[PDB]
From a paper:
To get a direct insight into the structure of AMBP bp65/bp69 and their linear analogs ln65/ln69, we performed several crystallization studies using either the compounds themselves or their racemates to be crystallized as pure compounds, or their fucosylated derivatives of both mirror image peptides as complexes with the P. aeruginosa lectin LecB. While previous reports of similar mixed chirality AMPs concluded on either unordered conformations or helical conformations appearing in a membrane environment based on deconvolution of FTIR spectra, here we reported X-ray crystallographic evidence of short mixed chirality helices consisting of only natural residues existing as helix bundles within the protein environment of a lectin and almost perfectly superimposable with their parent homochiral α-helices. These direct observations unequivocally demonstrate that the α-helical fold with only natural residues can sometimes tolerate multiple stereochemical inversions without significant conformational changes.
In the case of bp65, bp71 and Fln65 the peptides were aggregated in bundles of four of more helices via hydrophobic contacts between leucine side chains. A closer analysis of the different X-ray structures showed that the peptides did not make any significant contact with LecB apart from the anchoring fucose residue. By investigating the structure of AMPBs we discovered the mixed chirality sequence bp69 containing seven l- and four d-residues folding into an amphiphilic α-helix within a stapled bicyclic peptide similar to the parent all l-AMBP bp65.
Author numbering:
A (entry chain G), C (entry chain H): 103 to 114
B (entry chain E): 7 to 13
D (entry chain D), E (entry chain B), F (entry chain A), G (entry chain C): 1 to 114
The structure:
Amino acid sequence: XXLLXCLXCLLK
Amino acid sequence: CLXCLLK
Amino acid sequence: XXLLXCLXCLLK
Amino acid sequence: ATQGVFTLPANTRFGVTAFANSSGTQTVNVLVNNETAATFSGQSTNNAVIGTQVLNSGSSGKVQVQVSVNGRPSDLVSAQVILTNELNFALVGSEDGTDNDYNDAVVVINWPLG
Amino acid sequence: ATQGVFTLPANTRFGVTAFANSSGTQTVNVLVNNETAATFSGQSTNNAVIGTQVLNSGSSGKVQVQVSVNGRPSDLVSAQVILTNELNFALVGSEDGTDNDYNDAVVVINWPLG
Amino acid sequence: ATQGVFTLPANTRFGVTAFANSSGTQTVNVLVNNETAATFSGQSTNNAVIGTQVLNSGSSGKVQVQVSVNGRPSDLVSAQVILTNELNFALVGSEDGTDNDYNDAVVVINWPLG
Amino acid sequence: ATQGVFTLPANTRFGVTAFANSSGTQTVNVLVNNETAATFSGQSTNNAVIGTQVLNSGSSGKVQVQVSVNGRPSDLVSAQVILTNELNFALVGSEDGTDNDYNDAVVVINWPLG
Ligand SMILES: [Ca+2]
Ligand SMILES: [Ca+2]
Ligand SMILES: [Ca+2]
Ligand SMILES: [Ca+2]
Ligand SMILES: [Ca+2]
Ligand SMILES: [Ca+2]
Ligand SMILES: [Ca+2]
Ligand SMILES: [Ca+2]
């Protein structure tokens, strides 16, 4: 879901 | 109820 | 209001 | 989670009413825009109305209910309920002790009025 | 669907309180086991408490709220809400006219008490 | 009173989910700004999810649930509850028959999402 | 106060359904009689149904919802709502982080079924 979603998705 | 008895 | 009811009212 | 905080429609008249069910004297503070707008106080173990008042939700609409007994903040539980998409209740219960009946002070906020 | 009828735990004391927001005089009847247990009446457009009482839900637990204005039954909306699996509210709104604000008589029933 | 109509915050994504508890095939229509936005249709006597979907409340924010079985409109009951001044549920029950369990189609709307 | 604990009517079938709105994977545990009866898991930021199941409330009727994310328990909010004195919803929100939208796992319990 954008740069936001990707980070969240990656780290969690 | 017969209608229901067919459920 | 009984023993307990008195203690109640008394202490608080 | 935070309890006792409700966002009403701004600049709106609402009713706030408090009942007591405790041996401790209840102190109910109603905050509007984070400043005290009403304070009720009283003791009862038979659901006596210790206060009722009409207030205005102000520019923010933020209404907070706080309950203490002898200086000690009570544990709060709350919810808001809407009936037929119009009639609003903000509900608060509080526990001043250990029996966990959460009725020691009960606060009902309703709107609209009139 | 039926509105204003609640099944309380049997033989339990509960508080019932009514507010008025209407030019019409509200009559609030509270039935327990299909018999009238309490009757409130008053007129206000500013959320005045026109009645508050403690009643007993009786052997059936069946409590019904009926609202009328000059004998004309009002349309009811209702629900029951439970907080932390303990504190119970039964809520009634009513409409006596055409504006559909459903605040003309507002009734709050709460339990447990004490 | 009117049931199954909720005013959401405008332009807000929300979930809608429908469960079935009836011999009859349930049809759930979700309307947004008075137009059909979603339609679920399924049959179960064991609470099966017959549809779930994320919709947009639109510029008006007005969301309406309608239920029917074989062209016959179901009687609706509804309410909205808000938890910790943030989490919203709009709840619908429906009765397609005479036993009045009002679970024949059950519709849950929740927001916010994400 | 305790949240996520509901006393259902005993030996009663109920629906339990969980939705997810979070970058973190949600684990939802449903205890009956203080023992795990179902566990749901899944990740979604779009309100996906991560689990739905019918269970029996058992001899005690005690149902508890627990939510965690990678083993970290979430903060819970909850309430029970009853429509037309018949249709029940037990509702849970949960927060796994710092933004406090309390939708990260949303859990809906409904009864009666059938
Ligand atoms: Ca207490
Ligand atoms: Ca008490
Ligand atoms: Ca009116
Ligand atoms: Ca009015
Ligand atoms: Ca039915
Ligand atoms: Ca049914
Ligand atoms: Ca969150
Ligand atoms: Ca979230």
